[PDB]
Subunit: 491 residues, 4 copies
């Protein structure tokens, strides 16, 4: 309700110290605070955020607060929260937080629901804006509205919320069961809750590829109920966070969760997109022999041109040492694959959720034995072969689960985009007239802003930009102040 749910408020001092050190490099957020803390462009805005509550995220939240917004926050992953970062926010009254490291899936959805719940002075209401990372906040909202419509239609709790199985007879994921449990609970309390939030919702800014995919599907089906900004596809996000962020954070995660030396090992990177590219650079950097799997012939060729062998998993599963999933897809590592792996092979996911690796199938395999090697590291032994595989973070984000995620510099680039997106959505609220238009679309930030995010971080690294002369600008057909590239330029 009014008060936060965190692990330990006494960790606040450590969180505040890390925030100040992190700000040395997060110049984008620091500049936005300096430029807008007086004018308060977000004054009066109620912002709910679902995003890994790390030290870096604390600076984002602080920035939103300095710009005048009231804030409620939760994490987008059960293992990613840094307790000292959460405590710092609560200690300084920057936001109302519902997050802690090592949440149960049930608590995850309760926290998200709590973060979405705001008290109207003199009754309940929702947020004005949403910062989402993976689409869970956006999902609970849309599924909540659907549940309420189905509830009024038949005057009973929808049967899909009570069943433990899906349309095809398979067990629902824990995440779906726990969300449904929350939705059912809210239908019993107030069946106009979700639709009531739509009146004041002016938008959502989505951080990731996976979340953007869900938004684009809803958009094309006429089911998106609020404006949305795709932050992921800003050049200063997808080409930095996804690539250079993972280059460092994958290693940090592997070094903490995997005791073995990476040098000389055959490490399979499944997927060679923006994340995979970064993972491969990092792994090579410390002597690993990277093997790539890929479905896209263009991405496969890119891997080959960087000197990496490109194979189908079946041909290298028995001899490779470590497997890293970076596909954003489902079942890229099956139970059948894991049974063919060699003794003490390590398996990790840097992609999304926990379905890239079939963790459910592994945990529920008949007669399988499991032991905790350390926090968030489990060794599974098959009964017939007596061979074992070691899974990091129960198949969830290894960089945020076994380590602290991306470092401040690149997160400042991603989060500067987030703040700019929130400001865009808020400044455009007058155009959101639900007595007229209710089905909305997804847009991206302009190239001008994209270049601006980069400008804001040049001094951190002592970068000196060259300035075009009037003649040069005319010659390459651009303004001296940009933008410098066409909209289709790939960097």
């Amino acid at each position: 309700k009014m008060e936060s749910r965190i692990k330990d408020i006494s960790l606040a001092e450590f969180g505040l110290q890390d925030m100040e050190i992190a700000k040395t490099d997060m110049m984008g957020l620091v500049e936005l605070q300096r430029k807008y803390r007086d004018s308060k462009p977000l004054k009066g805005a109620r912002i709910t955020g679902s995003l890994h509550l790390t030290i870096e995220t604390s600076v984002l939240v602080e920035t939103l607060y300095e710009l005048g917004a009231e804030i409620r926050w939760c994490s987008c992953n059960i293992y990613s929260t840094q307790d000292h970062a959460a405590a710092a926010l609560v200690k300084k009254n920057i936001a109302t937080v519902f997050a802690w490291k090592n949440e149960t899936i049930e608590d995850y959805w309760v926290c998200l629901n709590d973060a979405m719940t705001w008290r109207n002075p003199n009754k309940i209401c929702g947020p004005n804006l949403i910062v989402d990372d993976g689409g869970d906040a956006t999902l609970i909202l849309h599924e909540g509205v659907k549940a309420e419509i189905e509830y009024e239609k038949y005057n009973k709790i929808p049967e899909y919320l009570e069943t433990e199985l899906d349309e095809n007879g398979k067990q629902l994921s824990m995440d779906l069961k726990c969300m449904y449990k929350v939705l059912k609970m809210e239908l019993l309390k107030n069946p106009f809750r979700w639709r009531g939030m739509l009146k004041d919702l002016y938008g959502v800014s989505e951080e990731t590829t996976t979340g953007v995919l869900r938004l684009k599907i809803m958009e094309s089906e006429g089911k998106l109920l609020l404006p949305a900004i795709n932050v992921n596809d800003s050049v200063t996000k997808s080409k930095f966070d996804n690539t250079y962020g993972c280059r460092q954070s994958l290693l940090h995660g592997l070094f903490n969760g995997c005791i073995q030396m990476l040098a000389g090992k055959k490490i399979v990177v499944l997927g060679y997109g923006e994340v995979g590219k970064g993972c491969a650079q990092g792994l090579s950097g410390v002597g690993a022999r990277v093997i790539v799997t890929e479905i896209d012939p263009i991405c496969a060729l890119q891997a080959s041109m960087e000197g990496y062998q490109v194979s189908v998993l079946e041909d290298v599963v028995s001899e490779a040492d470590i497997f890293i999933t970076a596909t954003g897809n489902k079942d890229v590592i099956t139970v059948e694959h894991m049974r063919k792996m060699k003794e003490n092979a390590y398996i990790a996911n840097i992609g999304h959720f926990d379905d890239e690796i079939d963790v459910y199938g592994l945990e529920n395999y008949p007669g399988i034995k499991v032991i905790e090697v350390k926090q968030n590291v489990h060794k599974f032994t098959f009964p017939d072969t007596q061979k074992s595989v070691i899974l990091l973070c129960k198949g969830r984000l290894v960089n945020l689960g076994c380590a602290t995620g991306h470092p401040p510099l690149v997160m400042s680039m991603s989060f500067t985009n987030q703040v700019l997106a929130q400001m865009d959505l808020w400044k455009s609220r007058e155009l959101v007239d639900r007595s007229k238009n209710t089905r909305f679309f997804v847009k991206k930030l302009s190239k001008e802003l994209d270049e601006y995010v980069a400008r804001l971080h040049l001094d951190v690294l002592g970068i000196k930009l060259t300035k075009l002369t009037e003649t040069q600008a005319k010659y390459i057909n651009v303004s001296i102040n940009g933008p410098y590239k066409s909209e289709d330029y790939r960097y």
Copy 2:
């Protein structure tokens, strides 16, 4: 009717290199195997302005096997490989007007000759090509400037004054390339003042290979001055993200090793521009121990360089201490005479970008009291009279990879050229939609992602790459077809 090349006896070496090159150019080999019977380009007259290398010979061969009649010239005075040209002439694949080390005057005469076709209806009459393969926009330029010249000629009933003067609108000397093109245009106005406009009737399009040429097309498009449909081949993912990057990673080094005697390891090498070309150049240079310093105007590109461990500086701060300078900007005057006077003894300067304007070669060659000596073929050392310091320029400021070496290797050129053939087939198959009886405006388009992915598929076996195939469930999960395309149109790879 007959070709102008250096030496037909080099044909055998050219044919041997073509066959070895085809081992890796599987895209072109597959197109030949798939379309040599159906002849999708049957009857098409294709004029090409593109570095006549062994790789280009396979492109030309592919177009010929698909049924086209061909006339070709190079797009750069130093890039032609004489054995490649001879091979084409020897086998009657095409009529060639190209040789290594052309004068600028001969360059434009060759281009004009390549654009000139004898009409098959009336053999005593002249006509133009149906399609154009252009690399830098010179073929597209002479066409548009030719039409302008003819309109101005009819208006005043005399040779336009801009074609006779040696100066431009601002009083500065015209570039040699402009003077020599103007000289050709003047000559053609005297022979036939309806030549260029007469070619428009049968022109169905141009497929442009490079960034620089695409820029010229986009300017014409926005001013309503583009006189034919165009396909931007450069911006295909299988071209800009491979040829420009990985091609230059190898070909820049080849060029530097041939033109620059010095060791690259430990040297401070400035790469001006960190776009698709600059990125590749930097990887290659680092790969052999150089300490790469990047200059850039785009803050996003500058940050990318920094994230790969490269120092990013303004030229003024590193010009006196750096050892080698490589221009990869596609811009003008990035290395001025004032910059070269501050450089250290025997600093090397090269351009991998475009034309010869990135470095102010004109200003250097015409500097008062400057001394020049030929170090070797296409390598000149300039000594300033006051400081007595020297700088060494590779290829008179023209493409170092194609001037001092043989350009990109077959594999990546097959990817670029597979796109070219597909573009030519697209333009030819769409002929009926080109209606000039109206005041139609032409635009620039790109090939589809389906074809872009196809180009990549065609080259996977060369390198033993094994693609994974999506299951029906996976395809639904990431919202794509099992056969693609696999990425949104805005995806940057």
Copy 3:
């Protein structure tokens, strides 16, 4: 005495699990256990070890035990011990351990002294020393030699030597904490038994030294005729110096920096002071994650090598104000002074991967007038100067960052180093009869043969699926080597 001093025996199960996972890659130690567990080549040997008590070290200790030795162990660094690794050893009765993470300097020397103290098997009421020593940095070797010196000076004047009671050195400056605490132990032992150290010499047959720094100390003693036992330089085996030092640090430096330094390494100017075997590895790792590495070096050959790998080579004074992170890998003293740290930019990070804590002048920093310090996290402190109000962040109080903020080198390379250690211990033990102390024998430092050096490498090839080519009889004759090696001359540098 009889029982171990560790933090928590209940952590044993986690330690045993990590040991088994680590053994998947430590094939050298696994092979030695399989080959010698029955014959017990070290049967009856009393071995004292001073070496970072990590999981990897636990497998070394286990190997020595399986080969028949009785063992007492302590760590060679106050922060490097992994408590679960120590517990595993105590739980299985493999050794008597005196080690825990985050020891005080006083406790460090007490633990070392305890590890060196053995109950004589003939008369249980009497004390004796070890037969062999595994040393990492030379502290075990130092306390022995300084102990003997102290005892000789004690008999000469029949009183406690004045250098052991004073808190100052010969020049009037404060003694290092490590010296004060060792002296405190030596004084205590002179009062208990002034023939303790010389009494250990009768049964000491050798020491196998793991590091460059320790080897330097041995070579100095050797040249002055002051080395009191045979010694084996393990560091200079090719399978140690060219792997552990280089590839080990390439991974463990990063692990340490990622845990202690919250910042992104990409695009940062990171100064690596020293470009030896450690520096080379550090630079590869840092570059691998996008850092712009700047090297400082005193050796013109090493400086050129750095330049050939694309690194700028500068003197610290010219880059101290603009660099972001500083890593000392010199094995030298005062490479980063207080004056240097005052010129650094806000929140610059400083770390040491070299030795002890004197590469960076931590004493001068901590004792600077009016300096403020705050704990950022475990083993990470931010120091703020009073005049400029600028701060610097020091990792592990200037001690080994890879072992202090992380878990040190991974198993594979430590197996290579430790396979050399076991082979050295076996060499020293098998040669005991030749150590005749009834004369004024002078001891020297030797290295393991190339045959054994190649053997260590052979033992680890299968781990990584490496397939060796075998020479034909003609090829072997052509390059003038035996089909079974060794394949290189003694001066070959790899």
Copy 4:
């Protein structure tokens, strides 16, 4: 022969221009010229050199000349000579040259013999030999020793030895072309003057050998008591083996491949046979341009090093059918056999960066029954087998690809190697009085000191803007070295 045998004297101007540009980076040679051109330490010395006559070598020759030596030179490889470099030397009277690009093997040995032949300054109508030899591969050293053996066998039976007339060896197999052509020269010299070779020994004071292969031959002669003159192993200087061999090949292999192989290296599986100093460099370069390097190796230590740098290590048999390009860097024989080449895929490229032409079995390939060969370009031949109709493309007939298809290593690293050469020549010349042949004196192979090795590196620091740090008196004492070095022990591997 008084006059030189070169291709074209008119190329002299281009050679002189390249020499001056090259000297910008060859600071070692430039410094030796500046320091010794007045004192002439080599005054009166007759120096014969057998070493790739490149622009870099021209600066070496110029340096020797400036130091006072009279010079005769030939190349050590039939394809390596740069004609403009040779012309420059002849044009300026720096030396008498017997070299040109694309020599026949017969002409190679005639040129070497001519370079070894000097007109005696006492009696101009009589012959004598050189005082000193600069050798690269050991051919100059070989013809001398085989010449002496031939003369001894000639006097013993008073007839031409039968091994010099036969075209076969002791086992009935064809002698290599290099042996036949050398024997043809030796036979010719026995008929003219059977005391020629032994007569040269009176005035021979030494040979400085540039390469690993040549050093091996010297070490064999040394151990058999058959070395007839003092020798200096230049290869094993740190400033040679750790730079020239590694960083030189990193650039020159690529240059050679780019000129001889039309294909793209990126994404190709390129097998590097041998991972020594040359192989290491080759692998870095190849990776640098996107190749996927696969290493073969016989030394388990070198194999592990490759693995730690991320390279697959395999036996050739397991990858020969699927790899694209093969580079031999072993210094061994028959590492690529005819059976291997028959299993290779269509248009696979094969090259050697090692030595001579026996790493790849070129003889077996060229003489294979029914094989077809075509010249693709200068020094590039495609061989097609008759049964499979598959082809393989061989660069430079299996000889040094970097010097055959390209111009060899660049000036900076050659200055480091050649500064060592000049210092070696000065050492041998200054020691001439100690060569007393009135006894049955046995000669040995020695190396230059670490002091000089460090000096070579110091001389090249300014070229690259390297700033060395200087030790304080306290630091120097702490690490036990002199402020001015040497900084490392003799066994240090860098």
